[PDB]
Write a protein that binds this ligand. Structure first.
Ligand SMILES: CC[C@H](C)[C@H]1C(=O)N(Cc2cc3ccccc3c3ccccc23)C[C@@H]2N(C(=O)NCCCC(F)(F)F)CCC(=O)N12
Ligand SMILES: CC[C@H](C)[C@H]1C(=O)N(Cc2cc3ccccc3c3ccccc23)C[C@@H]2N(C(=O)NCCCC(F)(F)F)CCC(=O)N12
Ligand SMILES: CC[C@H](C)[C@H]1C(=O)N(Cc2cc3ccccc3c3ccccc23)C[C@@H]2N(C(=O)NCCCC(F)(F)F)CCC(=O)N12
Ligand SMILES: CC[C@H](C)[C@H]1C(=O)N(Cc2cc3ccccc3c3ccccc23)C[C@@H]2N(C(=O)NCCCC(F)(F)F)CCC(=O)N12
Ligand SMILES: CC[C@H](C)[C@H]1C(=O)N(Cc2cc3ccccc3c3ccccc23)C[C@@H]2N(C(=O)NCCCC(F)(F)F)CCC(=O)N12
Ligand SMILES: CC[C@H](C)[C@H]1C(=O)N(Cc2cc3ccccc3c3ccccc23)C[C@@H]2N(C(=O)NCCCC(F)(F)F)CCC(=O)N12
Ligand SMILES: CC[C@H](C)[C@H]1C(=O)N(Cc2cc3ccccc3c3ccccc23)C[C@@H]2N(C(=O)NCCCC(F)(F)F)CCC(=O)N12
Ligand SMILES: CC[C@H](C)[C@H]1C(=O)N(Cc2cc3ccccc3c3ccccc23)C[C@@H]2N(C(=O)NCCCC(F)(F)F)CCC(=O)N12
Ligand SMILES: [Mg+2]
Ligand SMILES: [Mg+2]
Ligand SMILES: [Mg+2]
Ligand SMILES: [Mg+2]
Ligand SMILES: [Mg+2]
Ligand SMILES: [Mg+2]
Lengths: 192, 184, 189, 186, 184, 188, 187, 193
């Protein structure tokens, strides 16, 4: 399914699957629903790239509907921990934890292509069982939402109260609207 | 298949003629609708004679249980309650709701109390509403259980945090029933 | 199994003899068809005497609820509404539609209000038609609830955006009912 | 859901209403529903060919041929068949609402009326698909014209207005010509 | 759902049977055929001279069950009128055409459809052969009788039923499947 | 299933075509397919930012956002991206066919092109239905605007012509402005 | 499992080995995946040598009409003659592609089975949606029948009549019909 | 898992056997199996058009058209194709067993051979059933004719003998003309002398 690229060297042929070829140039793909497997791979790629060169930028491609919040925070905290700037670029769509991570790229280096779609909303979950178990689960997801909104406020310049209102239901943004919101810095226009 | 006794009655309708109502299954809206309609009918037949509510039930819907609860307290006749077999959760709540002095259990009947159960899926704000609602429902149940048993609200809360099984004698000491009915 | 009382009647048919109608389930077309026919029958028997609508319902179909609603408003007799157990969504809409001054709930009954639910699949234009339809239905429900409760249309809108649970006393203060029904006068001897 | 019994003799509630020439179309229209309704119409005509019949309609529609069983029986018999929409009348249901005796087609104020084109399907060879398409197109033309005749609207307007689901209030259905009066409370 | 009762108390269909009307209002299987032919035999016994009325709103079904109805109609003495209301397809339209000559009707918007029989066969080549010969022979029998009852040639019936062929009531009359379209 | 070819100076056949700057869009469009194609585009631009790229399209369409991932990457990079429809291009597939470099959008004579409006759904509260409805309508406005720009047809004509499934022959797709040329076979 | 052959040393699965000698396998139901592979193989072989013949093996029950036309149009586009040989069966779009080989170079082995019929499809929904689907599949059938007429020498009316229902032909009958040029007899 | 054997080349066991011109027909015959076998036959002919090929047959049969893909490719190519039944050869599998080079069709002593008529189906209108019935009947006539030529039995005898499942020992399949020889084991003295 995934194509292979083969390039000529002085000692023969060099074969990569396409994504590993991009990782050679410090490009990481967040191109699926965020689960623990996806997050583990991404944070390992980040750790490896920092070790290769702690000064060159890293590029995080984001085409993702979101997914697990804790998995998203694995990626978020690793981005903040390492030294290199991590650029983010939304191509296609970034929704929920996907758009949260978009907004977490290095300031000035968060991008979207002109027709990319950005969506923000509140976290989702569930709870079954006794009243006290329901209470624990509710308190947890409310605290998780407050943590998300606080960081989003710091990253966008929007107040926490406005974030709360704007994420109560699904909120779709064009690339330009996401820039005006403070989720990205620039809509990347086509090269000449 | 329910036997007939001879006017010809199925056995349960025959018992209803002598003012006996069966709460003998899981409590859902159908069961509750039937029981509260029987209560209203019996009140109309005679506003002074006692009514006898048989309880062999694992509980079920809290709102359906409160339909039965509110109709019992509304009507003029005393409603006796007798636990035979088991009364668990909303069933034991209704056992405690019978006319005071007239709440009974047979010696080997099982009584169980616990907190209400529910669920919620969706957005954080939806989970919050569902949580606030079932917590308020539990506070409502505990307050009434406190009034009917004489136990404090704090003791009810602690004693219902997990499944709490009581013998008939223990249900009497707790105040859920008034007497263990001896042979026969 | 529904008990019989002795002519022999099942218990619900016995209550219908005293002008009591049961709304005790999820509201679908079958349930609404039965209730509106009972209403038509009772009006024909006596166009002056009150009718009693028992409500223990989580709601259900909006159009089916409006079948009941329009039949209640059409006929001459007052239709009392009595919430026992629960009245949610279309169920609480119908609780609020009873004859004014004759809408009741028992002390521990639960009243819940919220916006209608629905769905849509297909082409953008088909989704648009379905969306405009359910929005218009919500406006229709909110307008009538506003008239019946005395609350403004915008307050109803805010208060039904999500599930809103009310105690019987809170439903009275809201205007969904007129009275929390107290226990009957009985002797202490 | 048990149907209550009334005393007058003892009837289930729907049989009691049928004693007063009231017929219930309160479900999806299939052949079973249609056969029952047309038999009730035939029975009521035989009891009295002059006195009105009352057709209650709370239906999402259904089978077109089953709908035409009801339509053709209404038109055949002598008594006027009043129609009243209570709750909803959609698709074939609203077609039958519009088929009641002229001047005696009603809706209650909050009833919902919906009109749209017929639905169907076809699987198989190209020639089989062609046959099914020609058939359902012919059925749509048949429906649109009767609707044009019953409403006073041009066929082309019916065609455009039924291309997609078209929801109407009771008042809009009156102005469209599908009903004669919105029955208001007194 | 429920079939209404009319008042002696009759369900509506039994009331219609009282006036010699038989309902063919569903897909034709053996159960439907057994009921209809029993009604036919009973009605003949009640009166061998008065007409019988067969209502037809059917998509067809089993060919042998259809021929049970066909043969019983031809056997008895009373004329059996047929009236298509709603739809008559395949074996349904075959039985419509089998009504007493001059007494086959359709209401103006009734739908009539004719086509060839449908079936299947699985297994060994020789088993497939037996089933193929059987359904071809069955088609020959239907076409021969349809020719006699419509006045159309066998070759035309064969061509006209090769694929689903929908007819209006007026077209069904011109074809010879019915005698008149019943006007209001 | 997929054959291997080996040159001596081993590829699956599609990787061999990628060596000559040919990308396959040969399936329903989901995020995985889009991620692969946009990465191939980025890689080919880096190999040579002047040589044309060739996008083969045999697709019934699929995800609109995934299609726009491909659309935006095509417009972003320097090389012209030719598009050729072989077999079928429907819905987002025909949108991407129309997005190829002006003058370099092709179809073979019997290829099938279909345009229609986007599909979706919504279930839940009235307010949720409204949000989903407003979103897919805005998505349709976005698709129609770009299709207008790429074809020369008015937005109003695109709207009318995509209300229901609209099948076009390759030649009709050329007259519509979705492609520039039908590539006709050589004489013998 | 597909066996490997070894010819330094180089290993091929048997189908990749045959492709090395300009042989392409159409041995399954025709869907987009099968069509994408075959047209890519055709493009590759043309690039290897634009003059030398290509051999298309056909053992297929047919499948998607658009996928088949992807293969049809690529065959006609490239310079090399594409021989077709039916081995086992060629039905529906399979027999259409069989008839589409370079003229003089369409073959079947003596017991190969050839079947022609009209295209199959479906439609669900509103009357207007059914009409669109019907008009589409009728136009597709006309297009197929037109090309089959040109490739076989039969009139369009005869193709329409002969494909109304499933029509089975022996290899010899396919030759007389004009679907193939020769029955390849054993040596 | 299929074991590997080891210039220094590594082969899975079946590919190693193919190097010595041995082809495995060891499963139900569908189009995939047939496509693989005919490609192996074509490859082996191109390697050497004179040397024998060995077709191992342990198969319950399957698709008739897929079987005829194998049959016609065997008859087309120049090398003799030996057939050896090991385990079982049923229906189309036994048809291919009888199709081996004359004098070179074998079975081991406890191998099972079964012949029967082809199986199929038909659904739909009477005329569609007629078309499917006529087709499978002609296919059976085609099979019976070739089996008659290959075995020496008359077409009418084959018809009768395949009307139902017909199980044959290796010796009975030889007497029938489906194979030429039962390959008997050599004794210990036979193996050393
Ligand atoms: C002082 C640097 C680290 C704070 C510290 C340490 O805490 N951790 C844990 C760790 C593990 C981990 C695992 C997966 C993903 C993210 C992480 C991660 C992310 C953020 C912070 C910590 C982690 C491993 C890391 N080491 C590392 O980076 N070695 C260089 C070679 C790296 C290469 F190339 F192998 F990738 C091993 C040596 C080491 O001291 N540390
Ligand atoms: C004064 C009695 C009631 C306060 C009052 C009234 O509010 N309601 C509503 C109601 C309906 C209902 C429905 C089902 C279940 C419970 C209930 C219920 C339970 C508690 C309180 C009220 C209800 C009906 C009842 N009536 C009744 O009892 N009639 C006499 C014959 C009754 C018989 F025999 F038919 F059962 C009808 C006349 C009437 O004034 N009322
Ligand atoms: C005041 C006259 C009515 C406006 C008018 C008329 O429009 N309708 C239709 C109808 C049918 C219907 C059907 C089911 C449910 C609701 C309804 C309904 C509800 C509201 C308004 C109308 C309906 C039947 C009713 N008739 C009726 O009431 N007969 C007396 C015996 C009644 C008894 F006992 F049988 F129930 C039949 C005679 C009659 O003139 N009308
Ligand atoms: C108006 C008279 C009819 C032109 C004629 C005739 O054609 N038919 C067939 C028929 C059958 C049928 C069957 C089901 C539904 C609809 C129908 C139907 C509807 C419309 C037209 C015809 C039908 C039966 C009817 N008869 C009838 O009405 N008898 C009186 C007592 C009837 C009672 F009480 F039993 F209902 C039997 C005697 C009779 O002459 N005719
Ligand atoms: C005309 C006389 C019959 C040739 C003969 C005879 O062969 N049969 C078998 C039979 C059974 C049957 C069963 C189901 C459906 C069709 C049939 C049927 C149809 C056609 C021909 C025969 C049948 C029963 C019938 N009898 C009958 O009709 N008695 C009068 C009371 C009738 C009543 F009211 F009960 F219906 C019993 C007496 C009797 O001699 N015969
Ligand atoms: C100034 C050039 C780019 C604007 C910028 C940058 O924004 N991005 C993000 C990106 C990532 C991405 C990921 C997947 C698909 C599409 C994209 C994509 C598509 C359009 C625009 C941006 C992207 C990566 C790219 N880099 C790149 O192309 N390096 C050369 C080698 C590339 C090779 F060979 F590895 F493919 C890494 C170095 C770099 O500065 N940039
Ligand atoms: C004669 C020139 C072509 C008309 C033109 C061009 O339009 N296309 C698109 C295309 C893509 C495609 C993709 C898959 C299947 C069929 C096709 C296809 C089939 C028919 C016609 C076109 C295509 C690619 C092709 N190129 C090619 O053949 N390069 C040589 C190396 C080829 C090798 F070895 F890699 F296969 C790339 C260079 C080029 O100009 N063209
Ligand atoms: C004996 C010569 C052939 C009549 C003729 C020709 O018609 N065909 C089609 C064909 C394709 C095919 C495909 C799969 C299975 C069976 C077949 C098959 C079986 C029987 C007859 C034909 C085929 C390919 C074959 N060629 C071949 O054998 N090349 C040498 C290298 C072969 C190797 F090693 F690659 F296998 C290509 C050169 C060639 O002229 N022909
Ligand atoms: Mg960083
Ligand atoms: Mg009391
Ligand atoms: Mg009223
Ligand atoms: Mg009339
Ligand atoms: Mg470009
Ligand atoms: Mg060519």
């Amino acid at each position: 399914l995934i194509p292979t690229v083969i390039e000529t060297t002085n000692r023969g042929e060099r074969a990569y699957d396409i994504y590993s070829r991009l990782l050679k140039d410090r490009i990481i793909m967040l191109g699926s629903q965020i689960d623990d497997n996806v997050a583990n791979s991404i944070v390992s790629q980040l750790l490896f790239l920092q070790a290769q060169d702690s000064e060159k930028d890293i590029y995080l491609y984001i085409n993702s509907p979101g997914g697990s919040v804790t998995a998203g925070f694995a990626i978020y905290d690793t981005i903040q921990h390492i030294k290199p700037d991590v650029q983010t670029i939304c191509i296609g769509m970034a929704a929920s934890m996907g758009s949260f991570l978009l907004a977490a790229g290095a300031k000035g280096k968060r991008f979207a292509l002109p027709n990319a779609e950005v969506m923000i909303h509140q976290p989702l979950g569930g709870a079954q069982g006794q009243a006290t178990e329901i209470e624990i689960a509710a308190n947890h997801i409310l605290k998780t939402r407050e943590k998300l909104n606080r960081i989003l406020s710091e990253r966008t310049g929007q107040s926490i109260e406005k974030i709360q209102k704007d994420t109560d239901r699904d909120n779709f943004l064009t690339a330009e609207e996401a820039k005006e919101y403070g989720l990205i810095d620039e809509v990347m226009v086509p090269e000449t």
